[PDB]
Amino acid sequence: VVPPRSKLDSILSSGLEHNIDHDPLEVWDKGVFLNELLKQGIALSTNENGTLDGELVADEGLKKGSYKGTRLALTEIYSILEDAAVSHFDKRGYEPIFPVKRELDLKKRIYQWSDGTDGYPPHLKVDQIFDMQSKIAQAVSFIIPKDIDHENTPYKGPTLADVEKFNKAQFPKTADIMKGRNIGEYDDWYSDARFAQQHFSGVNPSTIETASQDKIKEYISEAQKQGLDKVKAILEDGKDILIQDYSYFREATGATNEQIFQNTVYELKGTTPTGKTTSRYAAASVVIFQLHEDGRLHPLAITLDYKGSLDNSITIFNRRLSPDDTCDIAEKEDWPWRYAKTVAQTADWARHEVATHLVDTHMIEEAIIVATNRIIPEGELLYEILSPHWFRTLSLNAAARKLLVPGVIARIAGFGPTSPSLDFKGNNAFKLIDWSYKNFNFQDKYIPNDLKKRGFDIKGDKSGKYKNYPYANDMYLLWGIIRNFVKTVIESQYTSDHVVQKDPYIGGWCKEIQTNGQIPTFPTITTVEQLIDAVTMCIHTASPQHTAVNYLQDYYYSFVPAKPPALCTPLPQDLSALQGYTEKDLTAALPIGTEDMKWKDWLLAAQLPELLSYDYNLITYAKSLYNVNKNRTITENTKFNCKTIKKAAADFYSHLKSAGVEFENYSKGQTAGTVEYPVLQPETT
Amino acid sequence: VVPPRSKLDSILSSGLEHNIDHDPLEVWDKGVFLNELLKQGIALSTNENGTLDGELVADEGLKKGSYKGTRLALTEIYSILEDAAVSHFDKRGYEPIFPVKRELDLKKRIYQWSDGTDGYPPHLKVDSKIAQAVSFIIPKDIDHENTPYKGPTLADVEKFNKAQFPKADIMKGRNIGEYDDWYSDARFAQQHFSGVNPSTIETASQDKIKEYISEAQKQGLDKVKAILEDGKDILIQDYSYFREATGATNEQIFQNTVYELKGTTPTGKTTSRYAAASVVIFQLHEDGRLHPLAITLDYKGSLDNSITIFNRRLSPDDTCDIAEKEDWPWRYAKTVAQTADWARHEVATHLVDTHMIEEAIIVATNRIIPEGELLYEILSPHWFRTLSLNAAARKLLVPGVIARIAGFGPTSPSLDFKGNNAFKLIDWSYKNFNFQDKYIPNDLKKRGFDIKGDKSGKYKNYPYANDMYLLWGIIRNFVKTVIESQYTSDHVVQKDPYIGGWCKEIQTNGQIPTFPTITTVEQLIDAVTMCIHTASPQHTAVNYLQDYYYSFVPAKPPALCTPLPQDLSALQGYTEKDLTAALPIGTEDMKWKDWLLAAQLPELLSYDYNLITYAKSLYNVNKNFNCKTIKKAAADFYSHLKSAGVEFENYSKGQTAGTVEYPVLQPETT
Ligand SMILES: [Fe+2]
Ligand SMILES: [Fe+2]
DSSP states (O other), X not given: OOOHXXXXXXXXXXXXXXXXXXXXXXXXXXXXXXXXHHHTTOSEEEOTXXXXXXXXXXXXXXXXXXXXHHHHHHHHHHHHHHHHXXXXXXXXXXXOSXXXXXXXHHHHHHSOBOOSTTSSSSOBOXXXXXXXXXXXXXXXXXXXXXXXXXTTXXXXXXXXXXXXXXXXHTOOOOOHHHXXXXXXXXXXXXXXXXXXXXXHHSSOOSSOEEOOHHHHHHHHHXXXXXXXXXXXXXXXXXXXXXXXXXXXXXXXXXXXXXXXXXXXXXXXXXXXXXXXXXXXXXXXXXXXXXEOTTSOEEEEEEESSXXXXXXTSOEEEOSOSSTTOOOSSOGGGOHHHHHHHHHHHHHHHHIIIIIIIIIIIIIHHHHHHHHHHHHSOTXXXXXXXXXXXXXXXXXXHHHIIXXXXXXXXXXXXXXXXXXXXXXXXXXXXXXXXXXXXXXXXXXXXXXXXXXXXXXXXXXXXXXXXTTTOHHHHHHHHHHXXXXXXXXXXXXXXXXXXXXXXXXXXXXXXXXXXXXXXXXXXXXXXXXXXXXXXXXXXXXXXXXXXXXXXXXXXXXXXXXXXXXXXXXXXXXOSSHHHHHTOOHHHHHHHTTOSXXXXXXXXXXXXXXXXXXXOOOOSHHHHHHHHHHHHHHOOSSSOSSXXXXXXXXHHHHHHHHHHHHHHHHHHHHHTSOTTOOOOOTXXXXXX | OOXXXXXXXXXXXXXXSSOGGGSXXXXXXXXXXXXXXXXXTOSEEEOTTSOEEEEESOSSOOSEEEHHHHHHHHHHHHHHHHHHHHHHHHHTTSSOSSOBOOOHHHHHHHSOBOOSTTSSSSOBOOOOOHHHHHHHXXXXXXXXXXXXXXXXXXXXXXXHHHHTOOOOHHHHTOOGGGSTTTTSHHHHHHXXXXXXXXXXXXEOOHHHHHHHHHHHHHHTOHHHHHHHHHTSSEEEEEOTTHHHHHTOOTTOOOEEEEEEEETTEEEEEEEEEEOOOOEEEEEEOXXXXXXXXXXXXXXXXXXXXXXXXXXXXXXXXXXXXXXXXXXHHHHHHHXXXXXXXXXXXXXXXXXXXXXXXXXXXXXXXXXXXXXXXXXXHHHGGGGTTHHHHHHHIIIIIIIIXXXXXXXXXXXXXXXXXXXXXXXXXXXXXXXXXXXXXXXXXXXXXXXXXXXXXXXXXXXXXXXXXXXXXXXXXXXXXXXXHHXXXXXXXXXXXXXXXXXXXXXXXXXXXXXXXXXXXXXXXXXXXXXXXXXXXXXXXXXXXXXXXXXXXXXXXXXXXXXXXXXXXXXXXXXXXXXXXXXXXXXXXXXXXXXXXXXXXXXXXXXXXXXXXXHHHHHHHHHHHTTOOOHHHHHHHHHHHHHHHHHHHHHHHXXXXXXXXXXXXXXXXXXXXX
């Protein structure tokens, strides 16, 4: 044997065999991170008596850092803030960690309504770090250095081919797989096909709708003005013309048809503006599509920024009038049209992250959670069936309110008017949240109601023209299966409309949600059918809908050029300027290169999806419900038969597994080359 | 095309395609679990004020359940308790979640010393019924069908054990029962070198060898007497100290009388478990194979007053017309020795030597060294959320699990924690820990192992020792580079405002007088190396394969379910049925509970925590004392760790063929 002392001497005395620079950081050692935040004064300061003095120790943020180090630092500080929220929510009795018996009367005192003066729709009143009265956003701004190393970054470029090459080289390996890649895996990520497909199977699949006759007539007139006879004939024919309408952004912000969307970002030295500014731009875009009989959604027209009418706007029409159409200009080299698609993507980033995700799943659900906790006692069937879908939701939403919206979304959006905003009330991101919350319709977003209102005959169509809409096909199935389970459970106790109407809690529950919760579209439940649909909607909102709009966040956003949050240059002044656009015009509009603080925009655009990500599923739920109701004797509860709950859970489990097979078929049944849709695989939701 | 409405109608209207009973529960939906605990009154009760009234809602625990459902419920409630501890430790400022600047004077007020009236060595003063909550999750009775303890034979539990295996990564989800010859002399002895307690075996003193020479003379075993007289590499695992540790006389037996409770009230029904202050004598052969020669079941002052059995097999290669499998007296002896190692491992090697020793140093560090200091910055990352987990362990693991399945008693539950022999064993182990003697180089030398310089290959089956010599040397090198960046001479140490008080705080309030009076750079480096060793690789070494070595209970049970044999004569008559009665096998004598808790303990002690992640993190912050030196130290440490990782593999593969793997220190394991 060569003895241990010789193996030790040989390792210490020889040159290094392993170069640490060739081994990128994947995880922060949590203890080293906490020490470094403290060393850099990115920490709460205290008086001698051990209380917080409301300040941070540091006057200014980090001088210097790396892309990878900052990205990981942002995830780490967010996950720390989420841990702090859980701890505070435990301390305050909002979400106890160890189970505690609380009479309803105690819960009415614990769970209060916020008053709206924080700029948010009504949520849990939050009264350690959560003990003060928006400085937590200053701590995050300090983690983003003044400047970073631009070498071997995803934004460096300086060309699109350069960022594409870098993007591909970062993929691991040789549903699980899809998560750790992005749409840039496709060389034709920019294509009409993959652009339009996102409106059916991307992170925002539930807002595309049938174009009204009024809208089609606007686009008929605009095509007449541009002398485009072919596209005018397609619209006049009017065969399955669809719209993604983002024109409401102006109504939502109180912006006039003369005002442009601009975010003027002020560089800060601590709290003090340096005078250096960065401008980002948004657009209330409109996309017109045609759904072909073969199932392929084709984009026909994009209005960059809809300003009251098409007469007062810039509308470009696709050179290609069907999916297979050709012309002497390749899709890759059609820069005016690629610019238009990129603008429409910025619009969908806003609608997705603010409305479809934050409002429609988190803030709507929080009102219902608070209302439920205040009105329905913990012993009740209604509480037992809803509450498991709400585990640690209130604490995560508190973290999101303090950091995500003001610190990230308000920064990379192009609505402004300024970042940081001195007040919430001038800030267009907050107005968009307010408007989206006020204009959410709880019953219209019941899956069967939603699909019909948006003009999709998913129920009965046998043409196969919805084969590229797996969100809709999967959701029709999944809703029906969740409703079946809710039906079996609810009817165990609620044997007639009379039992609903005489219920001590349901009446007050609906009123609490409608008034204090400010969801007047929540039903006044007087029937078993209404009770089933409301409960189905709550479970849908909490689990599969949230999964659908969140699971592939990283896939669709992390390669920023495919779906940027905002434009880095002004819109073209008129249609003439747009038609002259080249590769350089689209590149300048994207956060590519080492100028104009664009590294920060790329970092935060790629980071947001990560912050919203990193057995929380219906199968685990079903097995768990089955298990406790196998263990229950029949005497225990008298309002419902727990053997029926056991039966419902067994049924639900099997129905979910069966549906999982169909979700696969609907994904594989898409037209050749279409991106996979594995987001609802039952042990995913 | 067949539309969605038809696929929905077809799934709802058809018989179920999937039977949920054929899909075992692996994860609790956390919300359903919390609701069910609340429904069963397994929850804290409150006054109108919203305050805790100190009681649980439920007066009695669950009536009925399954082995698998209870096991999963125990892990789930423990992980909840750990979350609650983190939340409390955040609330009280003990371990803030969000970073906060605290002046030293504030920290002296936050971090106080416990006074020992809780029965524990000195620890953090925190500011019970939480133990009653866990006892309620264990039902009064369970379903015995398709359980690992049912048996009723050893072959039956062996068959069940093997069938439950799934599919370093692999080793985790299996156990020593994967080997048909788990009971063998080879795999028994090997655990003293590469099991969960590899750091207590030692060179046998001349006095001890002379006792065993005399006992072999009494039994007329000429061959074994000649081997001992020759005295070539005779090693000892000595557990005789259990009597000194508990104040037990040589006339008293170790017994745990377990009282059946209806809520809190004894029914009068009891179950007995038995422990033994065993001694194992081994010979290390030149080829590296550790061979067990003799086991004293329970050492009671002398061998004259004890029961000592000597192996029929005098070398590893020996064959007797009685196969190892059918040598029930010897298999019984090995099983008794295993109970002794369970206690020494879980109490001393794990709980005291890594957690409680470390906690004193953490408290002392927080009270004396300000957060700005290099000493605080180098130590504190290795202590992330340790204080909260230790509090959970003090409230639940020791009184509720370890004191229940151990055979020391005198009774479970104990009204008086100071009168409980498990707590006396903790106290004794803490008082007799030698901080400087457990420096790896000091430890190997004191226990009589020439790991440093040996070229015979006789330590090829001691990968813990070989790996640790390397790893200690590498950690020390990193600590050296970092410490010397500020501590440029002994003078800078001696003039340090904090180090003097730090040492005194640990020695007095911390009750670790073996902690050095640090007046030199070399002493400072070794102390800091020891803290990092204790926090990371030593802890990993004694904890990582806990499940592998304990979860198949017959291979290493926590206690005996029957009394020891009366005398050597009785022991030599033992059969398969005698060993089986001693193990928690079958549906009688509450043995299902012992198996459940024995297999559960390792799991509860398991719920990128490594030196590679640490090194890369330190390197990265020091890309932006001379902090370029810290960057250099971290780069060096990273590379040295990777290089060592290759050697750890070689030392594992270099073991005599068929020896169990040792992947416990693979640098992204630590
Ligand atoms: Fe979310
Ligand atoms: Fe441990």
